[PDB]
């Protein structure tokens, strides 16, 4: 199974006074392991998972230095983009950057990404071959030409194929008891009458990890979406996730209906029935 390391950066300009609000988080798969918050007192990169606390003072000093450099790059960027898009200094604006890498089941580099947004829209993104750029508009074209001239892509690719994968590998190992453990969804079905003649069947999946999952309803062995309901997948708060899916059915006919659960932790999909 592949694994990913992603870093998420958000800078929000504060036109009234001061520097932008800047928040960085780092993830392995669906597990946040570090953060930086400019509003916080420490002005340090901080641990958010036990297995990263293994790292010594020099790791935290290095990460702190780099993430601080990141904050300033984004501050500069917010100014430059205001200029590109001819905006006043009155409004608050947002720059987001996400980058990271995947390793495959062979534990080797699988893919890399580096994506940039301004005010919640695509601005510029490294392409899958990590050698060129997708520019969304004409302002991003400037950035693209500037970055081609300074061969940023070559430098990024070096990071995404070397340092990035190397450290994902290290983290995967150190945190193997959680990061490499799948939590199969604990499933069950509930049932309650909505009338004398109808009932809602709700198929629950709880406490699963990673987030990726599919719940599907069937009637007499064919997919049914009509008269069904659902929630988007949600964090339980303890590092695991939850989802459910419901159908309304004629009462007495509950046995026709099956809930099917697909998840990595499940060797084979699970079929739940009322009774």
């Amino acid at each position: 199974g592949s694994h990913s390391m992603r870093y998420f950066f958000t800078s929000v300009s504060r036109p009234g006074r001061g520097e932008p609000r800047f928040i960085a988080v780092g993830y392995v798969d669906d597990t946040q392991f570090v953060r930086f918050d400019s509003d916080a007192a420490s002005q340090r990169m901080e641990p958010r998972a036990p297995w990263i606390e293994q790292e010594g003072p020099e790791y935290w000093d290095g990460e702190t230095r780099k993430v601080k450099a990141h904050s300033q790059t984004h501050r500069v960027d917010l100014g430059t983009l205001r200029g590109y898009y001819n905006q006043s200094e009155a409004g608050s604006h947002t720059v987001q950057r996400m980058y990271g890498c995947d390793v495959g089941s062979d534990w080797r580099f699988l893919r890399g990404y580096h994506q940039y947004a301004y005010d919640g829209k695509d601005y510029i993104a490294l392409k899958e071959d990590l050698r060129s750029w997708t520019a969304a508009d004409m302002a991003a074209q400037t950035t693209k030409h500037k970055w081609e001239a300074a061969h940023v892509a070559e430098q990024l690719r070096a990071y995404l194929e070397g340092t990035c994968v190397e450290w994902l590998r290290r983290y995967l190992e150190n945190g193997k008891e959680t990061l490499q453990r799948t939590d199969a969804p604990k499933t069950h079905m509930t049932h309650h009458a909505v009338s004398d003649h109808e009932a809602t069947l709700r198929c629950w999946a709880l406490s699963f990890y990673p987030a990726e999952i599919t719940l599907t309803w069937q009637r007499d062995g064919e997919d049914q979406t009509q008269d069904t309901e659902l929630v988007e997948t949600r964090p339980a708060g303890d590092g695991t996730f939850q989802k459910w899916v419901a159908v309304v059915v004629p009462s007495g006919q509950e046995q026709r209906y099956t809930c099917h659960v697909q998840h990595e932790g499940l060797p084979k999909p699970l079929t739940l029935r009322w009774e």
């Binding site: 993430v67 990141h70 790059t73 983009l81 970055w147 990024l156």
Partner: peptide
């Protein structure tokens, strides 16, 4: 581990 090289837009 974050990178590593910083470049402005």
């Amino acid at each position: 581990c974050v990178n590593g090289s910083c470049f402005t837009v």
